[PDB]
PDB file of N, CA and C in Angstrom:
ATOM      1  N   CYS A   1       1.218   6.724  -3.588  1.00 49.18           N
ATOM      2  CA  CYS A   1      -0.310   6.647  -3.532  1.00 49.18           C
ATOM      3  C   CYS A   1      -0.842   7.833  -4.028  1.00 49.18           C
ATOM      4  N   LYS A   2      -2.237   8.095  -4.009  1.00 48.26           N
ATOM      5  CA  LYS A   2      -2.904   9.407  -4.500  1.00 48.26           C
ATOM      6  C   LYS A   2      -3.544  10.079  -3.393  1.00 48.26           C
ATOM      7  N   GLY A   3      -3.907  11.391  -3.436  1.00 48.28           N
ATOM      8  CA  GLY A   3      -4.611  12.008  -2.552  1.00 48.28           C
ATOM      9  C   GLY A   3      -6.064  11.925  -2.922  1.00 48.28           C
ATOM     10  N   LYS A   4      -6.914  12.699  -1.960  1.00 46.98           N
ATOM     11  CA  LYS A   4      -8.423  12.589  -2.375  1.00 46.98           C
ATOM     12  C   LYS A   4      -8.646  13.344  -3.603  1.00 46.98           C
ATOM     13  N   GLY A   5      -9.388  12.880  -4.573  1.00 49.54           N
ATOM     14  CA  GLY A   5      -9.724  13.588  -5.682  1.00 49.54           C
ATOM     15  C   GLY A   5      -8.717  13.190  -6.873  1.00 49.54           C
ATOM     16  N   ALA A   6      -7.717  12.564  -6.544  1.00 49.47           N
ATOM     17  CA  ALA A   6      -6.506  12.155  -7.521  1.00 49.47           C
ATOM     18  C   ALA A   6      -6.996  10.799  -8.172  1.00 49.47           C
ATOM     19  N   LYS A   7      -6.355  10.525  -9.257  1.00 51.51           N
ATOM     20  CA  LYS A   7      -6.552   9.084  -9.860  1.00 51.51           C
ATOM     21  C   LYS A   7      -6.807   8.187  -8.850  1.00 51.51           C
ATOM     22  N   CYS A   8      -7.566   7.135  -8.877  1.00 51.92           N
ATOM     23  CA  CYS A   8      -7.721   5.917  -7.971  1.00 51.92           C
ATOM     24  C   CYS A   8      -7.285   4.494  -8.696  1.00 51.92           C
ATOM     25  N   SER A   9      -7.572   3.404  -8.104  1.00 55.20           N
ATOM     26  CA  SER A   9      -7.421   2.275  -8.773  1.00 55.20           C
ATOM     27  C   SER A   9      -8.286   1.143  -8.352  1.00 55.20           C
ATOM     28  N   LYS A  10      -9.207   0.926  -9.181  1.00 56.66           N
ATOM     29  CA  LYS A  10     -10.432  -0.020  -8.868  1.00 56.66           C
ATOM     30  C   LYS A  10      -9.859  -1.391  -8.593  1.00 56.66           C
ATOM     31  N   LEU A  11      -8.527  -1.625  -8.945  1.00 56.59           N
ATOM     32  CA  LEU A  11      -8.033  -3.022  -8.694  1.00 56.59           C
ATOM     33  C   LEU A  11      -6.849  -3.000  -7.594  1.00 56.59           C
ATOM     34  N   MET A  12      -6.592  -1.810  -7.014  1.00 53.82           N
ATOM     35  CA  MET A  12      -5.505  -1.658  -6.076  1.00 53.82           C
ATOM     36  C   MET A  12      -5.886  -0.680  -5.114  1.00 53.82           C
ATOM     37  N   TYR A  13      -6.707   0.198  -5.428  1.00 57.52           N
ATOM     38  CA  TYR A  13      -7.036   1.295  -4.211  1.00 57.52           C
ATOM     39  C   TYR A  13      -5.745   2.134  -3.730  1.00 57.52           C
ATOM     40  N   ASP A  14      -5.014   2.400  -4.623  1.00 58.07           N
ATOM     41  CA  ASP A  14      -3.879   3.218  -4.239  1.00 58.07           C
ATOM     42  C   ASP A  14      -4.191   4.607  -3.788  1.00 58.07           C
ATOM     43  N   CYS A  15      -4.925   4.690  -2.901  1.00 57.34           N
ATOM     44  CA  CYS A  15      -5.439   6.143  -2.371  1.00 57.34           C
ATOM     45  C   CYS A  15      -4.717   6.541  -1.018  1.00 57.34           C
ATOM     46  N   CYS A  16      -3.807   7.236  -1.006  1.00 57.03           N
ATOM     47  CA  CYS A  16      -3.193   7.790   0.290  1.00 57.03           C
ATOM     48  C   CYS A  16      -4.123   7.721   1.592  1.00 57.03           C
ATOM     49  N   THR A  17      -5.278   8.161   1.444  1.00 54.83           N
ATOM     50  CA  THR A  17      -6.130   8.263   2.444  1.00 54.83           C
ATOM     51  C   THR A  17      -7.469   7.728   2.130  1.00 54.83           C
ATOM     52  N   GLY A  18      -7.782   6.390   1.889  1.00 55.04           N
ATOM     53  CA  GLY A  18      -8.895   5.951   1.415  1.00 55.04           C
ATOM     54  C   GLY A  18      -8.916   4.858   0.132  1.00 55.04           C
ATOM     55  N   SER A  19      -9.965   4.684  -0.627  1.00 55.77           N
ATOM     56  CA  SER A  19      -9.792   3.841  -1.738  1.00 55.77           C
ATOM     57  C   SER A  19     -10.358   4.630  -2.987  1.00 55.77           C
ATOM     58  N   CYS A  20     -10.569   4.060  -4.127  1.00 56.12           N
ATOM     59  CA  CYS A  20     -11.039   4.668  -5.442  1.00 56.12           C
ATOM     60  C   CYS A  20     -12.403   5.197  -5.051  1.00 56.12           C
ATOM     61  N   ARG A  21     -12.808   6.067  -5.884  1.00 57.96           N
ATOM     62  CA  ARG A  21     -14.204   6.791  -5.809  1.00 57.96           C
ATOM     63  C   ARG A  21     -14.696   7.365  -7.067  1.00 57.96           C
ATOM     64  N   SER A  22     -15.432   6.451  -8.045  1.00 58.57           N
ATOM     65  CA  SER A  22     -15.779   6.954  -9.230  1.00 58.57           C
ATOM     66  C   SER A  22     -14.472   7.491 -10.176  1.00 58.57           C
ATOM     67  N   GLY A  23     -13.455   6.682 -10.036  1.00 58.00           N
ATOM     68  CA  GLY A  23     -12.327   6.987 -10.932  1.00 58.00           C
ATOM     69  C   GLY A  23     -11.296   7.964 -10.084  1.00 58.00           C
ATOM     70  N   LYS A  24     -11.846   8.556  -9.096  1.00 58.61           N
ATOM     71  CA  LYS A  24     -11.112   9.582  -8.385  1.00 58.61           C
ATOM     72  C   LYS A  24     -11.034   9.083  -6.988  1.00 58.61           C
ATOM     73  N   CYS A  25      -9.794   9.060  -6.337  1.00 61.53           N
ATOM     74  CA  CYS A  25      -9.537   8.667  -4.854  1.00 61.53           C
ATOM     75  C   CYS A  25     -10.577   9.152  -4.054  1.00 61.53           C
TER      76      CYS A  25
END
């Protein structure tokens, strides 16, 4: 997954602690 501020996934939400946010986790 990715940390906060790291690339996100509008179709997967691979955010270690949360979901996508404007392209950044």
